[PDB]
Amino acid sequence: SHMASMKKKGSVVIVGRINLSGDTAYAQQTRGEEGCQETSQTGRDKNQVEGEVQIVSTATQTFLATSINGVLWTVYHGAGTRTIASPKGPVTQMYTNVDKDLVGWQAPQGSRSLTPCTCGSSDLYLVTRHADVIPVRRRGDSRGSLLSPRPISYLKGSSGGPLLCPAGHAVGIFRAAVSTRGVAKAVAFIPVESLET
Ligand SMILES: COc1ccc2nc(C)c(O[C@@H]3C[C@H]4C(=O)N[C@]5(C(=O)NS(=O)(=O)C6(C)CC6)C[C@H]5/C=C\CCCCC[C@H](NC(=O)O[C@@H]5CCC[C@H]5F)C(=O)N4C3)nc2c1
Numbered sequence: 001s002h003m004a005s006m007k008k009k010g011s012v013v014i015v016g017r018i019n020l021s022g023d024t025a026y027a028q029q030t031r032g033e034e035g036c037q038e039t040s041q042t043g044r045d046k047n048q049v050e051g052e053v054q055i056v057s058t059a060t061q062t063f064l065a066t067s068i069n070g071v072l073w074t075v076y077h078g079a080g081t082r083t084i085a086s087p088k089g090p091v092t093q094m095y096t097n098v099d100k101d102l103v104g105w106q107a108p109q110g111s112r113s114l115t116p117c118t119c120g121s122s123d124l125y126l127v128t129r130h131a132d133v134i135p136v137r138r139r140g141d142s143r144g145s146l147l148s149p150r151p152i153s154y155l156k157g158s159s160g161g162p163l164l165c166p167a168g169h170a171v172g173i174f175r176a177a178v179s180t181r182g183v184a185k186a187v188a189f190i191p192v193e194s195l196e197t
């Protein structure tokens with residue numbers, strides 16, 4: 001049967017975190033590939049969630065997700081409409097806006113949220129999936145220039161991650177990057193003003 005064969009997409013799965021709790025940022029893995037794949041099909045994740053910045057994966061892609069205002073946020077171009085695995089099964093998005101490249105699920109129990117920035121700073125810090133902290137000078141409301149131009153491979157797979165102000169508040173989450181000749185020159189982010197409700 002055609003219809004009896006039709007499968008459902010898996011869930012997004014938290015497979016790690018970027019620990020920002022001390023004086024040193026570092027990535028932690030909390031689930032390997034096989035467990036990720038199994039957890040994606042069942043949607044049941046018994047792992048204890050911690051921190052603000054999660055490493056997340058689908059069957060095919062991996063990226064980041066950041067908790068702000070009690071919502072775990074990430075990019076639509078990573079997560080699409082997918083549910084997220086939780087200790088109680090798959091959890092449906094409570095926010096979806098493809099026009100902002102944004103989705104959100106209720107923050108997992110045990111997680112913490114970052115504080116939205118109110119400083120109006122232009123000195124930003126992008127945290128990557130590799131726990132690199134990359135100085136960015138803000139350009140207007142939703143863009144930023146890299147102070148230090150690195151290869152664009154350094155930024156691949158960090159969408160959903162936070163841009164932070166000097167005090168560690170969330171200014172937005174990383175959405176896109178602009179390069180020239182393969183060197184990253186600027187970034188676009190979803191302002192924290194939209195990361196609420
Ligand atoms: C499908 O529904 C939608 C809805 C809205 C929507 N909105 C945007 C902007 C969009 O873009 C897509 C995905 C996004 C991306 O790659 N995001 C990053 C990442 O890391 N992704 S990822 O985590 O690897 C991944 C893929 C999730 C797992 C962080 C970069 C890092 C490196 C980029 C490498 C080369 C790619 C350069 C692109 N450049 C660019 O578009 O610049 C724009 C154009 C001019 C201004 C500027 F904003 C770019 O950055 N893109 C291309 N797709 C969609 C799709």
Ligand SMILES: [Zn+2]
Nearest residue numbers: 117119165169
């Ligand atoms: Zn701030």
